[PDB]
Design a protein around this nucleic acid. Structure first.
Ligand SMILES: [Mg+2]
Ligand SMILES: [Zn+2]
Ligand SMILES: [Zn+2]
Lengths: 171, 112, 83, 79, 55, 104, 180, 45, 383
DNA sequence: CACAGGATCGAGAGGTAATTCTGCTTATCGGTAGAGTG
RNA sequence: ACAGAUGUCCUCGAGAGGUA
DNA sequence: CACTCTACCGATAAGCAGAATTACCTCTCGATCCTGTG
């Protein structure tokens, strides 16, 4: 489900680093910037492979100041929440609002009107969990979640999951 | 023949008092005014009625009529003219703006 | 598109190109940037730029755009400065 | 020099333009790092440009005149 | 209003009335005042014939 | 030339020396050259944007009035020679001040 | 940040299509036959969950040997995997990269296949069909028992009606995953 | 080159001094492309 | 469309790349036709008739009368065409029809030419002036917008409560006139809208048109800072590329200098001198962006200038500046000189320089412009 | 004792000279070949 | 429980008189 | 062979619209009533 793409990022290098090691400076800048970025269009850039392969081009010096802009051409693993598929995740939190299922670097939220009526909130057990007949989900449990959220990609992406229909349980 | 006669008339007008003007300027003027198959007068109905940029044409005369026509039609301003860059406050692609300057890695690693 | 090395522009540096490189180098030296020549007791960025250009030690690339859209890259060191 | 005198020496303005609209109807929240265009539902295609305030006034008046001066940062020749 | 603004007429229709009929007296030297007090104007609203000196 | 305008009935401007506390939006020029009546006595050298006439007008807590003084022209300087005070047609205050300078 | 040139009137297409639904209908940017950096016409990869773990581990060890030799020149089961992953991540990437730990843990504790030969067998088996790489990725990532369960969990699979070869390669995937 | 030519043509026009029409009116009628000039002429050899 | 591809002249007109010329040809060719056709003979076998799908109704003679269109129907009926029916007809126009006419499918459709929703400019477009003390006034745009809103409300109420058709007509005419005057107050053959005082209402078209409009008076040419103007004078002792700048003008004008090695001592000395002496600085721009005023703060403090900071020092000797005279007939009317500070308040230049400037010393005044960046200085020096 | 909001200007006329050279549009005339005969 | 003041530039359209 | 209007373009003749060098300095005024009210 993870995708390998050919994204590109523009870095405006300062003339103060216009030495023989500006290439490595751009390399470390790309690492420290792109990793952990929750871009709305793409998602999470988990890691960049072929570090000793990524190539830079001739940097265009802006008319305004001496800073040069470089258009790097890198490829990396991208994770997108997407919409309209099933996916397996592990719970990390629970409350009256719902359970915070975690899939990779994500936290998909399930609201009250999403899961079927076969789940009731209670705190009798050691972990606060939704307990009912033939359903047992806890703080740490297996759960299959179907995503139908609107993502709402604004400098960060999100996901909303559903528990309706069978196969969306522990199994 | 019309272009040659127009150049001769312009030269006669210019040289009537005694001043001297280089041939290149008058030749460029007469070539611009006769680029099409006929005379293109330097007026509102002449050069200002071509397929150039809407902003450049509107900057001379009849500002809102030209803009209204551009809005009614589908006019795309590719914007490499000087007037468009002046309006947008960008470095016009003329003189020193006709080229871009880039920095190469090999020269950096060779000079240092 | 780039015209390989079958370029057909002029092997010399125009006045506008000279002015643009001189200004860019002057700005770069005015800011904290490395200098690839022996200052030798000069402290004005523009004069440092001319001193660098004297023996073609400026790592700048000229991109001459053809009217169609193509462009060919000319190195500063390979451009003859006669003006 | 002409560009500097026209923009730096007189008036410089920074505005955000929607990548789909081409207009300047973009709500920018620098503190919250939010740039949403309500017209197109665009939140990842916002660019910032530097134009004189006179150009901003002219574009706003043209938009008030039911004319759209859409601005784009790319060439359509590649189709 | 007519004597102050110089527009010969009422407050309304001022744009259709003559302007410059009344002017502030120039008091910088005696000759300037004397010349100003003996000045005439020709309302023309491009043509060189009316401006030429006739016999 | 300065004048007092009667806005409404009781909102009338007055010629007096303003203060940084009661009044609001004072000019950047100095006010020490003014007097109790708000007019500078003749024979006092002035320069820059110094205030020559001190006038204040009520807005409508405190701060019931705002400064409305007319400063001297920035590019001109000289010595005040004659100060004229009288009343206009309606009966308010009318103040005229003259500045004399020599141009070598 | 983009990888495809503007085409088909991107400026004012308005709502070209609704966002991707269950029945395929891919997005504008994640369409098939992506533009390759050096050339053109590069198809979308077929990357599954187990393949992702191996790929990221290979990239990590490659970068590990890389900066290890650079600095040299300058000068059980799940439990064992977690410690190795932690000690590899402690200094290789550097910085903060908090999200990398969570996805690595998800890959380790949900690794359907833990051998290069296993993933090679599964994608050599899956390359026979002409299914969208998205469908084969979900098929090889999440284990399934019944054909209807696969159809419901992974939509846009209606092109297979026989379900005989589908049962065959489902059993193949099941035994390959149990052979871990 | 266009601006240079325009200025090099306009400067003598401003410096121009005061029966065949010549001077500023003739230049204006040439630039405007007048369909009916004041003083048409012919030359036959 | 009245004509179709069956006509040869229609085909020739449609085979035009230019949109304006094609539209003009279409209009000229279809103006003569005055009746819709249900069948047209084919190009081959003219006796045979091929249906084209027309309606057959006769066309009206559209004539412009003020802000309304009147159509004469001849079989004569003289009816006034309404905006609603015209909009309905425009909405029924096929895509190909206005594509060939000249309109755009997505960017500019013909049915959008009728104003149904009127945007209001923001307060920055039409600000409120200060007026005098305790007085507030509004721009003409605000008053015109209020008038338009009042007319719209009156029309809505008059339609809702029930009223004669004549009242509806007069209300809609008033609304149309107000909108037209909002967008154009110089319509010929019609009264010009007056303000409450009596002046004509300044429409946005007037603001966007003319020498003083926001095209030529604010975009083509504007007002800039770092400029000076005073009476010029002659100086035989000055070199050709030298201009005598008065001390006061040099003190007023400033040039930003980046705090860097090779001039840190000089910059610190200039800062210590202060803005009162001619060699000195007026502001010290920090890296963050905050501005330090050396005049107000003073304190004679030993401010440490970190690298990368900007210091706005006074213009010194051998500083390139732009020297211009109006009118600027040719390129020699504005040239770059070298600053030489002189102890008198008048511009001094070489006598041989006056000839290209076409200036004398009988009272002429000439402008001076100071570059504010290194690249601009280099361009002026080398060009 | 005292305040308030909408519109000039009217049958009647005309409150009135100083500019022209394009171009566009709308009347106007001035022509010229046919639908079939004695 | 708590809580009484300040932020720097205002005209705007016109008219008239002049300087190169 | 020209009999009467029918369809075509080629001249002519009146009505609109725009637009008029650049820069600068100073002063001086005006930004509203009355019929209709408690
Ligand atoms: Mg003179
Ligand atoms: Zn938008
Ligand atoms: Zn029809």
């Amino acid at each position: 489900m993870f995708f390998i793409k050919d994204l590109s990022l523009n870095i405006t290098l300062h003339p103060s680093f216009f030495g023989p090691r500006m290439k490595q400076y751009l390399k470390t800048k790309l690492l420290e910037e792109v990793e952990g970025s929750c871009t709305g269009k793409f998602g999470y850039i988990l890691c960049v492979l072929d570090y000793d392969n990524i190539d830079i081009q001739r940097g265009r010096i802006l008319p305004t100041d001496g800073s040069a802009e470089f258009n790097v051409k890198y490829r990396a693993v991208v994770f997108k929440p997407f919409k309209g598929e099933v996916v397996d995740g592990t719970v990390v939190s629970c409350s009256q609002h719902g359970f915070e299922v975690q899939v990779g670097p994500m936290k998909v939220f399930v609201t009250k009107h999403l899961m079927p009526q076969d789940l009731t909130f209670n705190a009798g057990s050691n972990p606060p969990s939704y307990q009912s007949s033939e359903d047992v989900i806890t703080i740490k449990s297996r759960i299959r979640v179907k995503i139908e959220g609107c993502i709402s990609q604004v400098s960060s992406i999100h996901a909303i999951g559903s528990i309706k229909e069978d196969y969306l349980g522990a199994i | 023949a019309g272009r040659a006669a127009l150049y001769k008339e312009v030269y006669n007008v210019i040289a009537s008092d005694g001043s001297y003007v280089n041939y290149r300027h008058m030749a460029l003027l007469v070539d611009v005014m006769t680029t099409q198959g006929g005379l293109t007068s330097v007026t509102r109905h002449g050069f200002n009625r071509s397929n150039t940029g809407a902003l450049m044409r509107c900057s001379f005369e009849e500002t809102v009529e030209i803009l209204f026509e551009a809005g009614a039609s589908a006019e795309l301003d590719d914007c490499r003219g000087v007037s468009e860059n002046v309006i947008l406050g960008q470095m016009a692609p003329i003189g020193t703006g006709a080229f871009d300057v880039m920095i190469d890695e090999e020269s950096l690693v060779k000079y240092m | 598109a780039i015209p390989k090395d079958q370029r057909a522009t002029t092997p010399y540096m125009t006045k506008y190109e000279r002015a643009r490189i001189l200004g860019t180098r002057a700005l770069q030296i005015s800011m904290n940037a490395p200098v690839f020549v022996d200052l030798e007791g000069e402290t004005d960025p523009l004069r440092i730029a001319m001193k660098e250009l004297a023996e073609k030690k400026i790592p700048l690339v000229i991109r001459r755009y053809l009217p169609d859209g193509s462009f060919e890259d000319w190195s500063v060191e390979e451009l003859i400065v006669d003006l | 020099f002409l560009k500097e005198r026209l923009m730096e020496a007189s008036d410089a303005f920074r505005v955000h333009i929607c990548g789909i609209c081409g207009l300047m109807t973009v709500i920018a929240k620098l503190n919250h790092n939010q740039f949403e265009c309500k017209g197109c539902d665009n939140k990842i295609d916002i660019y910032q440009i530097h134009i004189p305030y006179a150009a901003k006034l002219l574009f706003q008046e043209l938009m008030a005149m039911n004319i759209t001066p859409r601005l784009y940062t790319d060439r359509s020749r590649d189709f | 209003y007519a004597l102050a603004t110089g527009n010969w007429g009422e407050q309304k229709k001022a744009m259709s009335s003559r302007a410059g009929v009344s002017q502030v007296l120039n008091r910088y030297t005696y000759s300037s005042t004397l010349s100003h007090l003996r000045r005439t104007n020709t309302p023309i609203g491009k043509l060189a014939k009316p401006r030429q000196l006739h016999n | 030339m300065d004048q007092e305008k009667k806005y409404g009935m009781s909102i009338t401007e007055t010629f007096e020396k303003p203060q940084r506390t009661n009044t609001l939006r004072m000019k950047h020029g100095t006010y020490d050259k003014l007097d109790d009546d708000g007019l500078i006595a003749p024979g006092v050298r002035v320069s820059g944007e110094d205030v020559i006439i001190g006038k204040t007008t009520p807005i409508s807590a405190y701060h019931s009035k705002r400064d409305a003084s007319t400063p001297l022209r920035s590019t001109e300087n000289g010595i005040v020679d004659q100060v004229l005070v009288t009343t206009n047609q309606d009966g308010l205050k009318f103040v005229k001040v003259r500045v004399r300078t020599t141009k070598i | 940040s983009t990888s495809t040139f503007q085409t088909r009137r991107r400026r004012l297409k308005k709502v070209e299509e609704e966002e991707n639904a269950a029945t395929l209908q891919l997005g504008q940017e994640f369409q098939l036959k992506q533009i390759n950096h050096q050339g053109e016409e590069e198809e979308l990869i077929a990357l599954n969950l187990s393949e992702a773990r191996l790929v990221i581990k290979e990239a990590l060890v490659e970068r590990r040997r890389a900066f290890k030799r650079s600095q040299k020149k300058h000068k059980e089961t799940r439990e064992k995997e977690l410690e190795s992953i932690d000690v590899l991540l402690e200094q290789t990437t550097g910085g903060n990269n908090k999200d990398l730990k969570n996805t690595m843990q998800y890959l380790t504790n949900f690794s359907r296949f833990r051998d290069q030969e296993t993933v090679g067998a599964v994608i050599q088996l899956l390359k026979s069909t002409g299914l969208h790489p998205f469908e084969v990725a979900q098929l090889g990532s999440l284990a399934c028992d019944t054909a209807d369960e696969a159809k419901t969990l992974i939509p846009s699979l209606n092109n297979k009606i026989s379900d005989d070869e589908l049962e065959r390669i489902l059993k193949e995937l099941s035994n390959l995953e149990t052979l871990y | 080159v266009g601006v240079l030519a325009a200025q090099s043509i306009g400067e003598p026009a401003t410096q121009m001094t005061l029966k065949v029409t010549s001077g500023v009116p003739r230049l204006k009628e040439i630039l405007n492309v007048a369909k009916n000039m004041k003083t048409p002429s012919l030359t036959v050899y | 469309l009245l004509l179709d591809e069956h006509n040869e002249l229609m085909r020739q007109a449609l085979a035009i790349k230019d949109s304006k010329k094609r539209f003009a040809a279409i209009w000229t060719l279809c103006k003569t036709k005055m009746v819709c056709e249900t069948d047209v003979p084919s190009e081959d076998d003219p006796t045979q008739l091929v249906s084209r799908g027309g309606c057959g109704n006769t066309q009206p003679t559209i004539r412009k009368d003020g802000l309304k269109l009147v159509g004469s129907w001849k079989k004569p009926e003289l009816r006034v065409l309404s905006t609603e029916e015209i909009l309905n007809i425009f909405k029924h126009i096929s895509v190909k029809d206005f594509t060939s006419l000249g309109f755009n499918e997505v960017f500019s459709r013909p049915e959008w030419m009728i104003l149904t929703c009127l945007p209001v400019p923001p307060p920055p477009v039409r600000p409120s002036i200060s007026f005098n003390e305790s007085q507030r006034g509004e721009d003409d745009l605000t008053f015109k917008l209020a008038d338009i809103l009042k007319a719209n409300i009156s029309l809505e109420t008059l339609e809702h409560n029930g009223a004669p058709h004549h009242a509806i007509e007069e209300a809609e005419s008033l609304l149309q006139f107000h909108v037209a005057t909002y967008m154009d107050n110089d319509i010929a053959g019609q009264p010009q809208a007056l303000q409450k005082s009596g002046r004509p209402v300044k429409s946005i078209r007037a603001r966007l048109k003319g020498k003083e409009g926001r095209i030529r008076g604010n975009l083509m040419g504007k007002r800039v800072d770092f400029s000076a103007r005073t009476v010029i004078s002659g100086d035989p002792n000055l070199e050709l590329d030298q201009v005598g700048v008065p001390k006061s003008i040099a003190k007023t004008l400033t040039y930003p200098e980046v705090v860097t090695p090779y001039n840190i001592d000089r910059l610190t000395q200039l800062v210590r001198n202060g803005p009162n002496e001619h060699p000195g600085a007026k502001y010290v721009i920090r890296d963050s962006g905050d501005r330090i005023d050396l005049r107000y703060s003073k304190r004679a403090g030993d401010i440490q200038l970190q690298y990368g900071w900007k210091v706005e020092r006074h213009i010194m000797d051998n500083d390139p500046v732009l020297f211009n005279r109006q009118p600027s007939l040719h390129k020699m009317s504005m040239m770059a000189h070298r600053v030489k500070v002189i102890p008198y308040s008048t511009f001094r230049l070489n006598l041989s320089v006056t000839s290209p400037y076409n200036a004398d010393f009988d009272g002429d005044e000439m402008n001076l412009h100071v570059p504010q960046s290194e690249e601009t200085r280099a361009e002026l020096s080398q060009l």
